[PDB]
Amino acid sequence: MNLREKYGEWGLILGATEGVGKAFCEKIAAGGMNVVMVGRREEKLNVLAGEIRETYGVETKVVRADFSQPGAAETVFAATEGLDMGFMSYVACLHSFGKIQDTPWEKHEAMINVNVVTFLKCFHHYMRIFAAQDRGAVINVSSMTGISSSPWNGQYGAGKAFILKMTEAVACECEGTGVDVEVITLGTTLTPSLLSNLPGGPQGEAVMKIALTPEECVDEAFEKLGKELSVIAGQRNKDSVHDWKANHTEDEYIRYMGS
Template structure:
């Protein structure tokens, strides 16, 4: 698919440095779109941008921004104001493990900003542009923790649920327009963060057996773009969600998810 012809010249990936964000950058570049890459690690983004431009013959723009600071969006919007924007994906996320009351309030504020406020500001801004021009696409990234709830990681799960339900609703609102909106819900995904924290032995092997690559997740997202409002990545994750909803109570599902982090 020539994404540039369908949606516009530029796409923005919010949380682009590695993993799923990097895969989104590669995907839209392979579809002919120039890439706005936003994240905290500027040097890594510059290196990635050069690689993508060299490989796909597209332009790139790097914007350094900390999503925990909700004011960071002002710079993002200003630097993309004159560009023909046609795609947005919000991949950024932030979480802290521990009981709600044991987590410092400063961390809670950072999570709210990354997972809710900055997300909403970006979604609102670019949907406004896409709606006005009646052209564009959005793929936001949620997590299975947004379906199950996530004890000992509670605010993260709630934030991902916010992204999931808000994007699904907006996708329906946009269904009769030329703006395609979708949310993809990820399970275990092979990212640098996962590999860094992967347990050893059989537990780690089990995780890797069910995990998807970022590229697999992004490809599935684009395969469903314009066809469905919401997709769960991977057959394994789809079957697990169906099983839990059909054969277990909500309490059992929540308790199961909490068992991974309970000390």
């Protein structure tokens, strides 16, 4: 049985053009689902949509929305109305370097909108649909910064922790229903974002000993969907988190991040 048969006709990827987003689109398309792909870069989404259609033979719908902006979620809801929905993933994230006081309120609000408000509007709306039909799946993406905290980029971890804890709660609520919910928590992931800050050196190599590909993250999330509630992607990351939790104080972990 494939994802279309198990969960429903269309899957919604919220933040579809970067690495992990793109890999979600490809995975659900390979699983037979038609793909609603959402993000701010419409041209890039259109290219990806054509690639998905040509590679997988599924239908696509491209929705331009900026998740930092008011009305983004409503744009999405209008785009999916009348579709048989089987899947949602919230992938988008916004962070911004700076101490709390050095980041202007407008940017803080943008981050709240991406990581908290648009996130929850979408999660709530599609959970209503999935719960009413007693059928569907959600995999939301968090970050190890949601566990460690993120000094000098405080809202990264704060927002990702909101996503983590909200999704953990809902994952538990859905046990023994027809809706399967999971949060997958990512560490350092191989993106063009990353590679373009790795211009050379053995230190460039040292990052790949602990970087996962977007595909391996998505593969692990789907392997555990409906079995585990809260997953840390990759073995090394699981063990690293466990060693921080078990053998160090909270302060040591925070301070390590801030060092």
